[PDB]
Design a protein around this ligand. Structure first.
Ligand SMILES: Nc1ncnc2c1ncn2[C@@H]1O[C@H](COP(=O)(O)OP(=O)(O)NP(=O)(O)O)[C@@H](O)[C@H]1O
Ligand SMILES: [Mg+2]
Lengths: 143, 147, 246, 204, 510, 47, 99
């Protein structure tokens, strides 16, 4: 087992992150989400930047989906604000901004994401399969 | 049960001559037809019954029948559908179909009883109102219009 | 026949759909739709669930997958979740990653728990579930709770008196005592003596910040009846009872 | 009869021979009977309640918007998923979401005096949290970034922002008899029926 | 000629239409006046507004653009049937034929895995319905394709699953030929329609004098291709509201901005175009190869993505004569500040780009504490929420002398979820307090019980005939009336059934 | 505290209505009630 | 007199629907106040209001005045589990023990 840096994690193939309670497991999901939106981490980064509607997050409770949806909304907002101010008072955003190359284009993608946040993909499983079937029906052999 | 019963009757309708001009419904070209006109007639200051039905009764023989019509003060728009409007001899007309009458078949429709039912269902005020509408619409459309 | 559907039936039908020969087309669409997936609270996982996520993302390039879970926390077995399938996934994943520090609670609470689970070896009695000590953060270092002046230790175990105890006696007494302790914190909370303090900052203890965790319903009612007897208004958040029964 | 025979007539005129199970028609007709809507009284003059309809925009002095909770609006109907249009859009494509997003702009442009926007903050039942729709979110963002209250004319961008956004947002209470409603001020309730309750003037 | 009327607000445009009717009067009295609307409410409004000015309004035809355009093919071209040969309905019943025949065609295989599994035919019908719906959409918005698949060619650069759609389409054209029903349809027709008006005498018979497009902000490009070529004959007026007075649309190619540098003449004063001429083209606005970037107001950029494409269409018409009447709004209230900032297309958001900007807050606009123009209200339940709305409506009426409840609207995501609550609070209001209301778009339920009971009657062959379920059929007083079971006697059939041990299905056979 | 509810002064709203002639005959409350049909009836005993 | 007032209530019931009636009854009887005076009655009052709010939702879909009393009993028998008929939190005014 290796210790984790949110910004060092390669996002390729399957990856398991394990840690005890209160360790900020939920808290990290935000950071990886942003990272995914911007395509950051370099070597550890995903091949190409992704669109809010292409990111799947699956959580345990309907309430948790609401909360996490909100937190991701806020964090995208704040990070955008920072990208326009080029400085920030929070350490994680500060490291992200050190990694980011062009801050302007970054702010543009962020804005677009922020708009897309309505249809942003967050579900539970029982809320996921629900959608997915009704999405692609033939394959699934559904009405 | 109807089709052979209807197709005869309709012909009797379309073939009936009308008014004094003796017009047959059959004679009307689609150029002179206007079917089912919807109109909106604005009424500006509140329209009070008694301030009207006196004007009605005064010039109207038909409004002698039954009490003065009673409706609460109203200000607003008025709606209606002309069944049919057509012009013959350069002269317009206003046509409205009515059906009803559960009880009867024969002469229970006469010059008298028609005028009776008109006064019973208050089609009086109705036709007067349309005539107002058609009037304003012609005054609008026809250059140099005269009632 | 009715063309209806249900919760278990949803998951089941997606699993079956993938399972079928045609389903491989299906999977291809999803790998297009979501070329990443981050599953949270994965320590609770079903055989079906893992069969799905694997069959979709276990292979092909350019798709990621992120499983997030603490196997210590999987309590939902009754609902059909299974730890063993989690341990299976843990087996078939080459990479592991660990987060070091607890950010949630006081520096006292960390050391308390660590002490309590270090008492034996292999506390969780699954060789595959080792306990490890965790370290509090620096943001929390100043956290303290004060009740009538001097700080109250982070954890207080209330030991019953007497020799043999049946479940009923225990449920009466302990609920009652909990209530008595709760109203004391409150009365000291309205006078501003007892405080939740991060460093110099504080706030009195409102009946909001207290939570009482119980295993089952009857238990919870047992708590409330005594706790409202002391004129403390209380809610039960898991209550599934319907209005019409009142 | 009219609807039923309309269905079957649709069938015959299409030249469909095979025997048909009843369960096919029974569930067509169900769809056919509720399809109708009654808009008649729209502009009669009684204050107007109605859903947001595309391409209907009528200038008004006062526009109210309810149920802006996130995820309820905009409204979502996915494309069929084997649709080719949704794959490669051209200019004039219409998609329900963009329709709603544009409506919320229309209604803004249309209100000539008072705009009124409401959403459920907290589920009354569990006191869970709820959220505003992303549109309302963008709007309150724009307001708060473009204006400042006259109280602090030098404070800060973000601080004056959250300040304003606090001034524009009203949190109405959970119960009608909550006496906060009746404390004399700007927002005060016209319902006198709950007043003696709020005053707590009743005898046990 | 095709005239285009741009405006800030509708009340201008409606009045312009009034002026157009006023100056010029159709010769024939009975020729109705064509005004296109996309809804009923818009129509009803237009009437109520005209009739107030003229003193009456009647004979004004209010079709849908699709229905109208269809009506018009019949007039320009012979042989066309009055209703077309392809419908969102009939095409269903035809596909429900073709598909079984076409299974295992080596192409439709993907379908063959879907259907052949099993059915009472339910699935086949669902699929039929949806396919029909698409082909209709394609007809309107993508006729070139159906021209392709009608041939048997395929379209390059087109998503997968085409392959099983096209041959189904061809099979539909051919099959509906075999039934002999009229070949003509909206896709192949509109092209020859445009072409026959292209070279024609300016006076084809049967076409109406002048036509209006009022309040419709979305038309498929095909209809504009059509109406443009129509403009050579009949005078058409586009009444179009757009918030921004400048050009907030996109740019095709840097060679396409030249054509879009033309000007919009203003009836009120003088011709006008967008600001900063060619410099705003380079700028940051029209950037890369993509459309407009900054788009000025951040709101408009995000929300207006529809009117974007549409206003981009309208400016693409060659013969179109565009003129612009925009009524400036004077910023006072918060609301007017917003509607303004949208109108002149400026960004009033203070970013805090740099710290010297970021400290002082006064360069925002000041906001009076008294303004109710834009207000946000957080409630707990739908009930409580509507109930607050009521109070604020009253307060708004009391605060201004002329406000007619006619002037107030209340809009909802889904009206049926909020109907009962509205009907509750507006209904219970006491006299002095009580104000009238009308709910539109409620699902229209004229008779609940007969419909439901009847559907359950179609459900018999399945039905298990549970006692309570049979009695619910007696609940409906008509179905009892047929069987002359009075309501008083029906109290007995409640106990007897209970007491006599009637529970399970009807017969031994069942 | 003391507390009170405000009370509207002006009428909630006057009469502005869009009606047909049907919204005119309406119904009569009082001695005379207006209906299309005639209340008086005569039985026929011829058979 | 009592018989009379209820007879007016039936009128409100038929014309204006349900919730208006129960409103009128609550005002006239002063119950909504007298419960809040009574200890614990706050909860009881929440239940009453809640039930009324449901009698609207089922009140519209059913046309009859009488079939509604039909309906309410049937739900008194089977409470089910279902979400909306689940009890609302009693009061958010006072901070509460979240058990
Ligand atoms: N990197 C961090 N920096 C600052 N605060 C943090 C960080 N990570 C977590 N927190 C805080 O610590 C608490 C626990 O975070 P959380 O994400 O719930 O961990 P978790 O693993 O999901 N807990 P649980 O869901 O019970 O296992 C929250 O109150 C967070 O705000
Ligand atoms: Mg967590």
């Amino acid at each position: 087992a290796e210790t984790l840096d949110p910004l060092r994690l390669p996002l390729q193939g399957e990856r398991l992150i394990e840690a005890s309670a209160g360790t900020g497991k939920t808290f990290t999901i935000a950071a990886l989400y942003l990272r995914l939106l911007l395509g950051l981490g370099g070597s550890a980064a995903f091949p190409r930047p992704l669109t809010v509607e292409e990111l799947l997050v699956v959580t345990f409770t309907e309430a948790a989906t609401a909360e996490l949806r909100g937190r991701i909304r806020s964090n995208i907002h704040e990070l955008r604000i920072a990208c326009l101010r080029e400085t920030t008072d929070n350490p994680l955003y500060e490291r992200l901004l050190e990694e980011i190359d062009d801050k302007a284009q970054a702010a543009q993608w962020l804005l677009l994401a922020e708009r897309q946040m309505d249809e942003a993909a967050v579900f539970t499983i029982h809320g996921f399969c629900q959608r997915m079937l009704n999405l692609n029906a033939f394959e699934s052999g559904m009405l | 049960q109807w089709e052979p019963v209807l197709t005869e009757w309709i012909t009797a309708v379309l073939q009936a001559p009308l008014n004094e001009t003796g017009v047959s419904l059959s004679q009307l070209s689609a150029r002179n037809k206007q079917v089912e006109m919807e109109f909106y007639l604005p009424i500006s200051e509140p329209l009070i019954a008694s301030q009207l039905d006196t004007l009605i009764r005064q010039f109207d023989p038909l409004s002698a029948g039954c009490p003065p019509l009673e409706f609460m003060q109203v200000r607003g728009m008025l709606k209606g559908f002309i069944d049919l409007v057509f012009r013959h001899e350069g002269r317009y007309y206003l046509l409205a179909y009515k059906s009803n009458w559960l009880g009867e078949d024969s002469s229970a429709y006469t010059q008298q009883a028609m005028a009776a039912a008109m006064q019973a269902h208050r089609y009086d005020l109705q036709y007067q109102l349309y005539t107002l509408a058609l009037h304003r619409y012609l005054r609008h459309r026809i250059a140099d219009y005269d009632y | 026949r009715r063309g209806e559907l249900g919760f278990d039936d949803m998951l089941s039908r997606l699993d079956s759909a993938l399972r079928s020969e045609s389903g491989e087309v299906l999977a291809a669409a999803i790998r297009t739709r979501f070329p990443v997936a981050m599953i949270d609270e994965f320590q609770d996982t079903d055989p079906q669930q893992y069969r799905i996520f694997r069959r979709i993302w276990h292979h092909q390039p350019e798709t990621a997958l992120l499983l997030i879970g603490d196997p210590k926390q999987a309590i939902y077995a009754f609902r059909g979740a299974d730890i063993f399938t989690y341990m299976k996934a843990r087996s078939e994943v080459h990479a592991h990653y660990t987060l070091d520090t607890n950010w949630r609670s006081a520096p006292g609470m960390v050391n308390s728990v660590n002490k309590l689970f270090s008492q034996t070896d292999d506390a969780f009695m699954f060789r595959e579930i080792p306990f490890i000590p965790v370290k509090s953060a620096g943001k929390n270092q100043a956290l303290r709770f004060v009740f009538k002046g001097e700080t109250q230790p982070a954890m207080k175990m209330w030991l019953m008196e007497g020799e043999s105890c049946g479940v009923g006696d225990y449920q009466s007494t302990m609920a009652q005592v909990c209530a008595a302790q709760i109203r004391d914190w409150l009365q000291a909370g309205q006078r501003g003596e007892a405080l939740l303090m991060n460093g110099d900052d504080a706030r009195p203890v409102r009946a909001s910040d207290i939570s009482v965790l119980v295993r089952s319903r009857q238990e919870a009612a047992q708590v409330r009846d005594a706790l409202t007897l002391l004129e403390i208004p209380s809610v039960y958040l898991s209550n599934r009872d319907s209005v019409f029964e009142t | 009869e009219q609807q039923w025979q309309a269905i079957i007539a649709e069938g015959l005129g299409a030249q469909y021979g095979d025997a048909v199970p009843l369960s096919l028609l029974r569930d067509e007709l169900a769809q056919r009977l509720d399809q109708e809507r009654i808009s008649q009284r729209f502009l009669a003059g009684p204050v107007n309640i109605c859903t947001l309809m595309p391409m209907r925009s009528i200038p008004f002095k006062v526009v109210c918007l309810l149920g802006m909770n996130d995820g309820v609006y905009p409204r979502q109907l996915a494309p069929l998923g084997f649709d080719l249009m949704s794959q490669k859009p051209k200019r004039g494509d219409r998609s329900r979401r963009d329709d709603d997003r544009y409506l919320f702009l229309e209604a803004l442009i249309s209100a000539q005096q008072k705009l009124y926007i409401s959403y459920i903050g907290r589920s009354i039942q569990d006191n869970s949290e709820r959220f505003p729709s992303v549109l309302v979110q963008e709007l309150i963002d724009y307001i708060g970034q473009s204006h400042y209250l006259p109280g602090d004319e030098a404070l800060n961008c973000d601080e004056s922002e959250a300040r304003v956004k606090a001034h524009l947002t009203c949190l109405h209470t959970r119960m009608p008899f909550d006496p906060q409603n009746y404390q004399p001020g700007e927002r005060q309730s016209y319902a006198r029926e709950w007043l003696p309750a709020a005053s707590q003037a009743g005898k046990a | 000629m095709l005239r285009v009327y741009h405006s800030n607000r509708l009340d201008v445009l409606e009045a312009l239409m009034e002026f157009i009717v006023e100056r010029e009067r159709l010769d024939d009295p009975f020729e109705p006046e064509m005004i296109l609307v996309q809804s009923t409410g818009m129509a009803q409004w237009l009437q109520m507004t005209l009739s107030q000015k003229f003193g009456i309004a009647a004979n004004i035809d209010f079709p849908l653009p699709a229905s109208f355009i269809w009506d018009m093919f019949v007039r320009v071209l012979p042989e066309i049937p009055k209703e077309s040969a392809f419908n969102k309905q009939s095409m269903s019943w035809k596909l429900m034929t073709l598909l079984p025949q076409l299974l295992e065609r080596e192409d439709f295989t993907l379908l063959r895995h879907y259907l052949t599994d099993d059915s009472d035919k339910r699935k086949l019908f669902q699929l039929s319905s949806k396919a029909a719906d698409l082909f209709d959409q394609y007809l309107v918005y993508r006729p070139d394709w159906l021209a392709q698949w009608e041939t048997g060619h395929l379209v390059e650069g087109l998503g997968e699953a085409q392959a099983w759609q096209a041959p189904l389409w061809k099979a539909l054209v051919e099959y509906t030929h075999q039934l002999g029903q009229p070949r003509w349809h909206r896709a192949n027709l509109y092209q020859r329609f445009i072409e026959t008006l292209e070279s024609a005498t300016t006076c084809p018979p049967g076409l109406p004098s002048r036509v209006f497009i009022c309040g419709i902000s979305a038309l498929p490009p095909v209809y504009l291709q059509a109406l443009q070529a129509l403009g050579k004959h009949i005078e058409i007026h586009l009444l179009f509201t757009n918030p921004c007075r400048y050009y907030w649309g996109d740019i095709k190619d840097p060679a396409y901005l030249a054509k879009l540098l033309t000007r919009q003449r203003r009836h009120s004063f003088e011709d006008r175009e967008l600001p900063l001429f060619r410099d705003s083209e380079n700028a940051g606005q029209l950037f890369n190869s993509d459309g407009e970037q900054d788009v000025g107001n951040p709101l408009l950029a995000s929300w207006g993505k529809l009117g974007r494409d549409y206003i981009y269409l309208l400016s693409d018409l060659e013969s179109s004569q565009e003129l612009d009447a925009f009524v400036d709004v004077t910023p006072d209230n918060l609301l007017h500040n917003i509607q303004s900032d949208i109108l002149e297309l400026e960004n009033r958001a203070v970013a805090g780009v740099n710290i010297e900007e970021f400290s002082r807050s006064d360069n925002k606009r000041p906001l009076d504490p008294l303004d109710s123009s834009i207000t946000f209200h957080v409630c707990h339940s739908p009930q409580r929420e509507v109930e607050v709305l009521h109070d604020r409506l009253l307060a708004m009426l009391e605060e201004d002398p002329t406000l007619t409840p006619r002037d107030i609207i209340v809009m909802v995501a889904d009206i049926d979820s909020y109907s009962p609550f509205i009907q509750a609070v507006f209904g219970s209001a006491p006299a002095d307090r009580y104000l009238p209301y009308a709910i539109s778009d409620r699902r229209a339920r004229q008779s609940h019980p007969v419909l439901e009971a009847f559907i359950s009657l179609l459900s018999l062959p399945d039905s298990r005939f549970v006692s309570e379920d049979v009695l619910a059929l007696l609940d409906v007083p008509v179905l009892a009336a047929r069987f002359d079971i009075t309501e008083e006697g029906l109290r007995y059939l409640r106990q007897w059934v209970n007491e006599s041990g009637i529970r399970w299905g009807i017969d031994d056979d069942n | 505290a003391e507390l009170n509810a405000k009370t509207l002064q002006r009428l909630p709203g006057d009469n502005w209505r869009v009606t047909s002639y049907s919204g005119l005959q309406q119904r009569x409350x009082x001695x005379x009630x207006x209906x299309x049909x005639x209340x008086x009836x005569x039985x026929x005993x011829x058979x | 007199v009592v018989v009379e007032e209820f007879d007016g209530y039936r009128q409100i019931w038929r014309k204006r629907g349900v919730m208006p009636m129960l409103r009128a009854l609550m005002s006239a009887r002063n119950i909504a106040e007298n419960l809040l005076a009574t200890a614990g009655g706050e909860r009881r009052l929440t239940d009453i209001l809640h039930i009324s709010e449901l009698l609207q939702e089922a009140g519209t879909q059913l046309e009859s005045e009488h079939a509604l009393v039909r309906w309410l009993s049937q739900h008194i028998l089977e409470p089910d589990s279902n979400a909306s008929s689940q009890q609302m939190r009693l009061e958010s005014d006072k901070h509460l023990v979240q058990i």
